Amino acid sequence: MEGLAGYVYKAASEGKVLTLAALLLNRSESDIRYLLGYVSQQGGQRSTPLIIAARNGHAKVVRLLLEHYRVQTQQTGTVRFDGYVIDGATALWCAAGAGHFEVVKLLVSHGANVNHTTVTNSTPLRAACFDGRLDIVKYLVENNANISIANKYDNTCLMIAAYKGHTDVVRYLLEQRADPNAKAHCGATALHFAAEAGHIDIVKELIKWRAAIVVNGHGMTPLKVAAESCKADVVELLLSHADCDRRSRIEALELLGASFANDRENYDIIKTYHYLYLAMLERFQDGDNILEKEVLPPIHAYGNRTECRNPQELESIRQDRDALHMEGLIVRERILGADNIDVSHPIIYRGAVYADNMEFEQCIKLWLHALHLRQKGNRNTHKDLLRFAQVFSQMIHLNETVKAPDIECVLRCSVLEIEQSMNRVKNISDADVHNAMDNYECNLYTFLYLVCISTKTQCSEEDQCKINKQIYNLIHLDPRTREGFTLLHLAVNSNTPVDDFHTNDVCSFPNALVTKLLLDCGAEVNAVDNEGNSALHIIVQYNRPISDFLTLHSIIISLVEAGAHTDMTNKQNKTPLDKSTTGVSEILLKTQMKMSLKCLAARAVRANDINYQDQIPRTLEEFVGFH
Amino acid sequence: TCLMIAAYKGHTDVVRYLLEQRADPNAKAHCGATALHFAAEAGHIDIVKELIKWRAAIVVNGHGMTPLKVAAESCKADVVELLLSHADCDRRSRIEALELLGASFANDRENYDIIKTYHYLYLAMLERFQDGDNILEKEVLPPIHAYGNRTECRNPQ
Numbered sequence: 001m002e003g004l005a006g007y008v009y010k011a012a013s014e015g016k017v018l019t020l021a022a023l024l025l026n027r028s029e030s031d032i033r034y035l036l037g038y039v040s041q042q043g044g045q046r047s048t049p050l051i052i053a054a055r056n057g058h059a060k061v062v063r064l065l066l067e068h069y070r071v072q073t074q075q076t077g078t079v080r081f082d083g084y085v086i087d088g089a090t091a092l093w094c095a096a097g098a099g100h101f102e103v104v105k106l107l108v109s110h111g112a113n114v115n116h117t118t119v120t121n122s123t124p125l126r127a128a129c130f131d132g133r134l135d136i137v138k139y140l141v142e143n144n145a146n147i148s149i150a151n152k153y154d155n156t157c158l159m160i161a162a163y164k165g166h167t168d169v170v171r172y173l174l175e176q177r178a179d180p181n182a183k184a185h186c187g188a189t190a191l192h193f194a195a196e197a198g199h200i201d202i203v204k205e206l207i208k209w210r211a212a213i214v215v216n217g218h219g220m221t222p223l224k225v226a227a228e229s230c231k232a233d234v235v236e237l238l239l240s241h242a243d244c245d246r247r248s249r250i251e252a253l254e255l256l257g258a259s260f261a262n263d264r265e266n267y268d269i270i271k272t273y274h275y276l277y278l279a280m281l282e283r284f285q286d287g288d289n290i291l292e293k294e295v296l297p298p299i300h301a302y303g304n305r306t307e308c309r310n311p312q313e314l315e316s317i318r319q320d321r322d323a324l325h326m327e328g329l330i331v332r333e334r335i336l337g338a339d340n341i342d343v344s345h346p347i348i349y350r351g352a353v354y355a356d357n358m359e360f361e362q363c364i365k366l367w368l369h370a371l372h373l374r375q376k377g378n379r380n381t382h383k384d385l386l387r388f389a390q391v392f393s394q395m396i397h398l399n400e401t402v403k404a405p406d407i408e409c410v411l412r413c414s415v416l417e418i419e420q421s422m423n424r425v426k427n428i429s430d431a432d433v434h435n436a437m438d439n440y441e442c443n444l445y446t447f448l449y450l451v452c453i454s455t456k457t458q459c460s461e462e463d464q465c466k467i468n469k470q471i472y473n474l475i476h477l478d479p480r481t482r483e484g485f486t487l488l489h490l491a492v493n494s495n496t497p498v499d500d501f502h503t504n505d506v507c508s509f510p511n512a513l514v515t516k517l518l519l520d521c522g523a524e525v526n527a528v529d530n531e532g533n534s535a536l537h538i539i540v541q542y543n544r545p546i547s548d549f550l551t552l553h554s555i556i557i558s559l560v561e562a563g564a565h566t567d568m569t570n571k572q573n574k575t576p577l578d579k580s581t582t583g584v585s586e587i588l589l590k591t592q593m594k595m596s597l598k599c600l601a602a603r604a605v606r607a608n609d610i611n612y613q614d615q616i617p618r619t620l621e622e623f624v625g626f627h
Numbered sequence: 628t629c630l631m632i633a634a635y636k637g638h639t640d641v642v643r644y645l646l647e648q649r650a651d652p653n654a655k656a657h658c659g660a661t662a663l664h665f666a667a668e669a670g671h672i673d674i675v676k677e678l679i680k681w682r683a684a685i686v687v688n689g690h691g692m693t694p695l696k697v698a699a700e701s702c703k704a705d706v707v708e709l710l711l712s713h714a715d716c717d718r719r720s721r722i723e724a725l726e727l728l729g730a731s732f733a734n735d736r737e738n739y740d741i742i743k744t745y746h747y748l749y750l751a752m753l754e755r756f757q758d759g760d761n762i763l764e765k766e767v768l769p770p771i772h773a774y775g776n777r778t779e780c781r782n783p784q
C-alpha cells in the first residue's frame with residue numbers, strides 16, 4: 001500500500017499534474033487522504049505530498065493538491081537543511097526554504113497556517129529569511145505572519161535576517177514594524193548581529209529605528225563587537241552616531257588596532273601602530289588630563305609584557321613587529337578579559353605561526369594559557385592535546401627538546417581531568433557520543449604517545465615521581481576500551497593509529513621500556529579482555545620474531561616476572577603455549593616456565609570431567625577455572 | 628642481464644615491469660649468481676617477496692653460497708626472516724645461518740652490535756639442545772695461535 005505513497009511522492013517530486021492525478025485516480029477517498037497524510041521520510045525528515053511538493057518547489061503539484069485534494073496545510077514536518085535538523089516545520093516552512101515563489105503563492109492562497117506550534121518554534125518567515133528571497137518574505141508577512149515569533153533561542157526572523165546580511169529583507173521587516181529590541185538567549189541585540197555581519201546599511205537602518213545600546217552578557221557592546229570583528233567603518237559609524245567618552249573611544253581604537261595586529265586574517269601591523277599611536281595621543285591630547293594607564297604584571301609567557309604608556313615608548317617600537325604583536329595580545333587580553341572563550345582562537349594561532357621554526361618555548365606558554373582558558377570552559381581539547389603531541393614529536397625529532405617536566409605534568413593533569421569528564425559524558429548517554437568514544441580511544445592513544453615521549457627523555461627523580469603520581473592516578477581508576485583492553489594490552493598489541501606527523505623513531509609498538517614502566521606502576525597483570533586473552537596471549541602472536549628479537553626477549557622476560565600465570569586457559573581452551581604461531585616463541589616461554597604441583601593437579605582434574613563444586617575451598621574454584 | 632643488475636640496484640618498478648614481460652628469472656652469469664643473490668645483497672624485502680611470488684627457487688652456486696647464507700653474511704635480517712619463512716629447510720642449515728648472522732654482527736664495522744650477536748648465538752645454541760637425548764653434534768676445530776685460546780663453546784655454561 002505504501003508503494004502508492006512512494007509513487008505519489010515521486011510524482012510530486014516530478015512536478016507533473018498528469019502523473020500525480022493518474023496515480024491518485026482510481027483510488028478510494030480514504031486511500032488518497034492517507035497518501036496526503038502520509039510522510040515519506042526518505043532522508044529521515046517528514047514530508048507529506050503537500051510538504052514535499054512545497055520543499056521541491058513544483059507549482060503544478062502544489063496547485064493540484066491544494067485545489068483538487070484539499071490536503072491539510074497545517075501538517076508540520078521535521079525537515080532538515082544542510083545536515084542540521086529542525087524538529088518542526090509546516091508545509092509553508094518548506095515552501096519558504098525551497099525558494100520557489102509560485103509554490104509559496106499557491107500555498108498561502110490556500111490558507112497555509114503561518115503560525116504553527118513547534119518545539120523549535122520555527123516559522124515560515126524564518127525559513128524565508130534563511131533562504132533570503134525578499135518576495136517570499138513580503139508575501140508571507142502580508143498574509144498574517146508574526147515577525148515577533150522567535151525560536152527556542154529567542155532568535156526572531158529579523159535577527160536572523162540581519163545575521164544573514166540581506167538588506168532587502170531587513171528593510172522590509174523594519175517597514176512592517178518588526179521589533180529589533182527582542183533579546184536572544186545570549187541577550188545580544190540586533191546591533192550586535194549587524195556588527196557581526198559587517199553590513200553598514202543594516203547598521204544605519206537599525207540606528208534609524210533608534211535601537212537601544214544594550215551590553216550583552218559577556219560585555220561585548222556593539223562598538224566592541226564591531227571592533228573585534230574588524231569592522232572599522234561600523235566602529236566609526238557607531239562612535240559618530242552615539243556619543244562616547246574619551247575612555248570609550250580610546251579603548252575602541254586600541255582594541256581595533258590590537259585585533260588588527262593579532263588576527264592572521266587582517267595581518268596589518270601598520271594600521272595597528274597607527275591606531276595605537278592615535279589612541280595614546282588622544283590620551284595625552286588634553287594636556288595634564290591623561291587617561292589612567294594600567295600595566296598588566298609581567299608574565300613569563302609574554303616575557304617583559306610591559307604595557308607602554310608614553311609616545312616615546314611606542315616610538316621606540318616602530319620596528320620589532322613581534323613586540324608589536326605581543327603588545328597587541330596584551331591589550332586584547334586586558335580589554336576583553338578571560339570571561340569569554342573568544343580569545344581562545346588567536347593565542348594558539350599566534351603560537352602556531354611562531355611555531356613555524358623556533359625553540360617553541362613561549363609558543364608552549366601561550367598554548368598553556370589557552371589550555372587554562374579552555375579548562376575553565378567545558379570545551380573538548382582532544383584535538384588540542386593531539387596538537388601538543390605532534391609538537392612534542394617535532395621537538396624530539398629536532399633533538400633539542402630539553403623538555404621541562406612541569407609542562408608535561410600540567411598537561412597530564414588536564415588530560416586526566418578531561419578523561420574523567422568524558423567518561424561521565426559516556427555515562428550519561430552512548431549513541432550521541434559514539435564519536436566521543438572514538439575520542440576516548442584517541443586520548444588513550446595520546447597518553448601512550450606522552451609515555452613514549454617520557455621514556456625517550458629523562459629528568460630529575462622528583463619530576464619522575466610526579467609523572468608516576470599522575471600515571472598512578474590514571475591507573476587506579478580502571479580505563480577500558482571497546483571489547484575491553486587495559487593499558488598494557490594496547491602497549492603490547494599493534495596500535496594502529498601511530499602518529500602520522502612522526503611515525504618513525506618515535507611511538508613504535510611492542511616497546512619494552514613502556515611495558516617496564518607500566519609494570520613499575522603496577523597495572524593488573526592477570527587482567528583479561530573479552531574472550532579472556534591475557535597479556536601473554538597478545539605477545540606470542542607477533543609475526544616478526546627474528547627481527548626486533550631484543551624487544552620480544554625483553555618483554556617476555558619482563559612479563560614472566562611480576563607474577564604472570566605460565567598457563568591461563570580462556571574461553572575455548574587456549575594455553576599461551578598453544579596459541580603461539582612463530583615456532584620461535586615457544587623456546588623463550590619453556591626456558592622461563594616454572595612448574596608446581598598445583599598446575600598439574602588442576603590440569604588433571606579438569607581434563608577429566610569431575611565435579612568440583614561445593615567440595616572444595618571457595619578460593620580454589622577460581623584456580624580450577626583458570627587451569 | 629638487465630634483470631639481475633636491476634635487482635642489484637633495487638629499482639622496484641623496472642624489475643616488476645620486466646617480470647611482467649614473463650622473462651625467466653632463473654638466468655645465470657659467469658659467477659652463477661641468480662637474481663635472488665643480488666636482491667639479498669640489496670636487501671629489498673619487497674623485491675625478494677615479488678621474486679618468490681612468481682616461483683623463484685633457491686639454487687646453490689658451485690662454491691656453496693646458498694642465497695639465504697649470502698644474505699645472512701651481509702647482516703640482512705629481513706631477508707633471512709622472509710627466506711626462512713617461505714623456503715623450507717632443515718635444522719642444520721637454519722642454525723648455521725643463525726650462527727653466521729651472529730658472527731657477522733659481531734665482527735663487521737657497519738653494525739658492530741655485541742649484544743645482538745650474543746643473543747642470536749644464544750638462541751641458535753638453545754635451538755641446538757632443544758630436543759634432549761637427541762643432540763645435534765658440534766665439531767670444534769683445533770685452536771689457532773692467531774686467536775689465542777681459540778676453543779669454541781658447546782655447553783650453555
Ligand SMILES: [Zn+2]
Nearest residue numbers: 565567599627
Ligand atoms: Zn598455574
